[PDB]
Amino acid sequence: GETFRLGVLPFGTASWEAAVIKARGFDTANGFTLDIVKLAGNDAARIAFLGGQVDAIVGDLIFAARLGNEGRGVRFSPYSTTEGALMVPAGSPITDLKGLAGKRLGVAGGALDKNWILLRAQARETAGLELENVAQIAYGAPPLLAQKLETGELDAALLYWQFAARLEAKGFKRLISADDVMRAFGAKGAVSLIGYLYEGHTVADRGEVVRGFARASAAAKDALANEPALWETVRPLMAAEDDATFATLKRDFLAGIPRRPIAAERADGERIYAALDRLAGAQLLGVGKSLPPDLYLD
Ligand SMILES: O=C(O)c1cc(C(=O)O)c2c(n1)C(=O)C(=O)c1cc(C(=O)O)[nH]c1-2
Ligand code: NA
Ligand code: NA
């Protein structure tokens, strides 16, 4: 038949809808078999993608644009409009981004992470502040940062959205999302920065498997939005034995299901991208002059 290899992170949310696709036979319904490939982290996943070891991974539009500008035929399809969480201790003095000055701030994904680019752009626009000049920045994978924020070695951490529900149950508050930043910028609607990244070669030679997987994913998300009972089936993959954590993860996932046409998604991405590569012409590191051509999957 046709096998589609999806690379997934152990702390990621893509494994949730992948389990729905398999359980409900939404891959079979689309003429393919989904093979979930477990990758240990984003660095390994990006290499697996560069090495052609998977047909797709989940990633961000800014990384996708960078691979496209670097010559790759990668295509992007919206995965979620829920992205990023700046977590501070409950009761923290920190009410604004200026309060990060002097703080040990964890930043998931490194200096070029999309959530960090957004947050740095916001701090420059609203306070004329370069967070890298005032905060003690510690980059790292989200699990490590969340643990060290819990242990008190970090004063704050910019993490993936799922880590909010988890930390709220342990004494932490989400001060700001990447979605909050893009609304402050003025985006027309919910912007999907997180998407499926499809291998150019798979798009060219197995385009119907790509479309079959895209349909299977949309059907899985639709099932989770329409069938509350299905969430209890996928709970083991969510690391959510705590009830408030399980409920918050569901709420934030549902709020992020993409529900706008690709044309509108593309135009918002184009404008937010063009607004990032600015901030007093700071040519923010990680951001190219413009999006590479034909990045979005039709
Ligand atoms: O910024 C975010 O909140 C966020 C969330 C998630 C997610 O939903 O797991 C991913 C990412 N970012 C991300 O950048 C990424 O590459 C990624 C991969 C996966 C996955 O499940 O395999 N999730 C995510
Ligand atoms: Na590619
Ligand atoms: Na379908």
XYZ file of C-alpha atoms and ligand atoms in Angstrom:
324
model
C 0.000 0.000 0.000
C 1.333 3.443 1.040
C 3.125 4.186 4.322
C 3.325 7.768 5.645
C 6.121 8.381 8.164
C 5.312 11.114 10.699
C 8.103 12.158 13.054
C 6.802 13.103 16.517
C 8.317 14.493 19.744
C 7.748 12.682 23.084
C 6.463 15.868 24.794
C 4.602 17.064 21.712
C 0.836 17.176 20.998
C 1.003 15.685 17.431
C 1.102 12.193 19.002
C -2.457 12.838 20.279
C -4.136 13.227 16.872
C -1.791 10.587 15.405
C -3.290 8.133 17.907
C -6.801 9.220 16.826
C -5.920 8.692 13.127
C -4.768 5.127 13.901
C -7.578 4.298 16.355
C -10.375 5.553 14.062
C -8.779 4.198 10.847
C -8.646 7.682 9.279
C -5.414 6.631 7.511
C -7.123 3.513 6.081
C -10.043 5.776 5.105
C -7.504 7.813 3.065
C -5.706 4.851 1.449
C -2.533 4.872 3.552
C -0.904 3.528 6.696
C 0.382 6.041 9.230
C 3.777 5.115 10.706
C 4.520 7.219 13.799
C 8.294 7.688 14.098
C 9.407 8.658 17.624
C 12.195 11.265 17.601
C 13.902 12.349 20.863
C 13.913 16.099 20.227
C 13.546 18.890 17.694
C 17.231 18.819 16.704
C 17.005 15.089 15.906
C 13.641 15.583 14.154
C 14.990 18.369 11.919
C 17.934 16.139 10.929
C 15.562 13.213 10.235
C 13.662 15.610 7.992
C 16.870 16.831 6.295
C 17.976 13.171 5.936
C 14.695 12.054 4.322
C 13.980 9.559 7.134
C 10.367 10.798 7.566
C 7.685 12.215 5.228
C 6.756 14.944 7.703
C 7.429 16.529 11.080
C 5.603 19.244 13.038
C 7.406 22.558 13.156
C 7.141 26.294 12.900
C 6.581 28.561 9.882
C 9.814 30.509 10.559
C 11.928 27.327 10.535
C 10.042 26.130 7.438
C 10.743 29.486 5.692
C 14.455 29.165 6.639
C 14.681 25.616 5.154
C 12.873 26.877 2.044
C 15.233 29.869 1.756
C 18.131 27.412 2.294
C 16.960 25.478 -0.770
C 14.575 22.770 0.567
C 11.199 22.012 -1.170
C 9.442 21.830 2.238
C 5.678 22.594 2.337
C 3.716 23.869 5.393
C 0.135 23.077 6.502
C -1.421 24.715 9.596
C -1.359 22.436 12.678
C -2.348 24.817 15.503
C -2.984 28.479 16.365
C -2.083 27.702 20.023
C 1.616 28.451 20.516
C 4.018 29.401 23.314
C 3.719 30.118 27.016
C 5.847 32.504 29.130
C 5.557 30.958 32.589
C 6.361 32.796 35.823
C 5.901 31.770 39.438
C 2.405 32.425 40.751
C 2.298 35.778 42.550
C 5.380 36.939 40.603
C 6.149 40.694 40.594
C 6.551 40.272 36.801
C 3.439 41.847 35.163
C 5.297 43.056 32.000
C 8.257 41.971 29.776
C 10.504 44.660 31.402
C 10.282 42.638 34.677
C 12.422 39.922 32.996
C 15.494 42.152 33.518
C 17.983 40.390 35.831
C 15.958 37.116 35.708
C 17.194 33.620 34.762
C 14.903 33.108 31.749
C 14.602 29.734 30.091
C 13.920 29.843 26.343
C 12.857 26.650 24.584
C 14.299 25.879 21.155
C 17.294 28.170 21.146
C 18.070 31.706 19.951
C 16.103 31.289 16.675
C 12.917 29.791 18.251
C 9.759 31.364 16.790
C 8.233 32.136 20.225
C 11.486 33.856 21.290
C 11.599 35.929 18.065
C 7.999 37.060 18.773
C 8.706 37.877 22.408
C 11.954 39.764 21.601
C 10.134 41.720 18.880
C 7.335 42.577 21.367
C 9.807 43.771 24.043
C 11.648 45.929 21.477
C 8.374 47.433 20.176
C 6.773 48.118 23.602
C 9.777 48.938 25.811
C 12.764 49.514 23.513
C 14.401 46.591 25.318
C 16.606 43.755 24.008
C 15.788 40.867 26.388
C 19.156 39.168 25.551
C 20.947 42.232 26.995
C 19.061 42.313 30.327
C 17.976 38.725 31.131
C 20.184 35.719 31.885
C 19.037 33.531 28.961
C 19.187 29.725 29.237
C 18.188 27.828 26.098
C 17.047 24.265 26.253
C 14.514 21.601 25.420
C 11.100 22.319 26.981
C 11.121 19.347 29.494
C 14.492 20.445 30.984
C 13.378 24.091 31.251
C 10.046 23.180 32.869
C 11.857 20.980 35.421
C 14.448 23.669 36.236
C 11.685 26.301 36.551
C 9.958 23.929 39.036
C 13.296 23.373 40.926
C 13.883 27.167 41.197
C 17.071 27.313 39.044
C 15.136 29.498 36.546
C 12.900 32.497 37.413
C 10.788 32.188 34.242
C 10.562 30.132 31.079
C 9.247 30.537 27.536
C 7.940 27.063 26.691
C 5.612 25.223 24.347
C 1.940 25.797 25.185
C 1.264 22.312 26.627
C 3.771 23.011 29.432
C 1.408 25.744 30.872
C -1.352 23.366 31.983
C 1.308 21.200 33.447
C 3.033 24.020 35.383
C -0.164 25.761 36.514
C -0.821 22.707 38.708
C 2.632 23.158 40.289
C 2.720 26.854 41.249
C 3.159 28.768 37.962
C 1.160 31.232 35.790
C 1.105 31.851 32.014
C 1.885 35.583 31.723
C 1.818 35.749 27.895
C 1.354 33.472 24.846
C 2.827 33.929 21.378
C -0.854 34.286 20.337
C -1.137 37.250 22.734
C 1.888 38.856 20.991
C 0.450 38.395 17.496
C -2.899 39.889 18.618
C -1.009 42.893 20.070
C 0.718 43.209 16.659
C -2.815 43.302 15.125
C -3.193 40.016 13.194
C -6.533 39.637 11.308
C -7.260 36.320 12.984
C -5.775 33.262 14.690
C -2.346 32.621 13.131
C -0.958 29.071 12.757
C 2.812 29.318 13.413
C 2.910 25.568 14.104
C 2.305 23.295 11.124
C 3.021 20.040 9.435
C 6.218 20.289 7.369
C 6.054 17.907 4.396
C 9.125 16.726 2.542
C 9.371 18.256 -0.920
C 10.058 14.790 -2.390
C 6.944 13.287 -0.750
C 4.863 16.245 -2.071
C 6.225 15.620 -5.578
C 6.075 11.793 -5.797
C 3.418 10.851 -3.206
C 1.153 13.934 -3.195
C -2.031 11.886 -2.608
C -0.458 10.329 0.531
C 0.301 13.891 1.678
C -3.303 14.910 0.904
C -4.578 11.693 2.502
C -2.600 12.447 5.656
C -3.745 16.102 5.648
C -7.368 14.909 5.438
C -6.808 12.286 8.127
C -5.372 14.962 10.455
C -8.296 17.364 9.817
C -10.748 14.516 10.491
C -8.932 13.609 13.730
C -9.020 17.237 14.933
C -12.712 17.444 13.975
C -13.420 14.263 15.962
C -11.665 15.686 19.068
C -13.727 18.908 18.736
C -17.013 17.002 18.317
C -16.557 13.887 20.505
C -15.514 14.665 24.134
C -15.364 10.897 24.883
C -12.453 10.468 22.414
C -10.192 12.559 24.689
C -10.419 9.943 27.442
C -9.179 7.382 24.876
C -6.047 9.532 24.155
C -5.362 10.663 27.759
C -2.427 8.164 28.233
C -0.405 10.054 25.542
C -1.038 13.454 27.201
C 0.888 12.894 30.492
C -2.171 14.329 32.254
C -3.117 12.274 35.337
C -3.875 15.607 37.080
C -7.487 16.597 36.246
C -6.902 20.359 35.926
C -3.942 19.630 33.607
C -6.086 17.329 31.399
C -8.884 19.913 31.184
C -6.497 22.837 30.398
C -4.704 20.830 27.684
C -8.036 20.001 26.051
C -9.237 23.621 26.219
C -6.015 25.022 24.704
C -5.803 22.311 22.013
C -9.432 22.887 20.924
C -8.911 26.674 20.821
C -5.954 26.060 18.446
C -7.653 23.853 15.825
C -7.131 25.729 12.522
C -10.508 26.939 11.135
C -9.521 29.562 8.519
C -8.937 29.059 4.755
C -5.276 28.550 3.616
C -5.399 31.858 1.677
C -6.190 33.758 4.912
C -3.618 31.734 6.857
C -0.961 32.554 4.221
C -1.736 36.309 4.142
C -1.560 36.571 7.968
C 1.683 34.571 8.011
C 3.099 36.826 5.320
C 2.168 39.978 7.262
C 3.377 38.694 10.687
C 6.640 37.530 9.040
C 7.140 40.950 7.405
C 6.368 42.605 10.764
C 8.952 40.383 12.589
C 11.878 41.156 10.184
C 11.518 44.831 11.280
C 11.413 46.427 14.790
C 13.490 49.511 13.789
C 15.001 47.404 10.953
C 16.696 45.152 13.550
C 16.797 42.313 10.945
C 15.843 39.921 13.803
C 18.173 36.880 13.649
C 16.273 33.853 12.297
C 14.017 35.961 10.034
C 14.657 36.311 6.267
C 13.702 39.292 4.104
C 10.436 37.536 3.118
C 8.724 34.102 3.076
C 10.162 31.684 0.484
C 7.812 31.095 -2.485
C 5.082 28.369 -2.563
C 5.813 27.478 1.119
C 2.164 26.760 1.987
C 0.631 23.441 0.879
C -2.350 23.977 -1.468
O 5.297 26.742 20.474
C 4.507 25.860 20.822
O 3.640 25.982 21.681
C 4.682 24.514 20.199
C 3.817 23.442 20.491
C 4.048 22.201 19.912
C 3.082 21.084 20.223
O 1.898 21.318 19.976
O 3.479 20.017 20.670
C 5.141 22.083 19.009
C 5.954 23.222 18.810
N 5.712 24.388 19.386
C 7.103 23.159 17.906
O 7.770 24.133 17.617
C 7.457 21.824 17.252
O 8.398 21.796 16.493
C 6.634 20.685 17.603
C 6.706 19.327 17.266
C 5.663 18.671 17.875
C 5.318 17.269 17.861
O 4.365 16.940 18.522
O 6.029 16.512 17.241
N 4.939 19.594 18.597
C 5.503 20.833 18.401
Na 12.123 19.260 1.852
Na -11.011 12.132 4.951
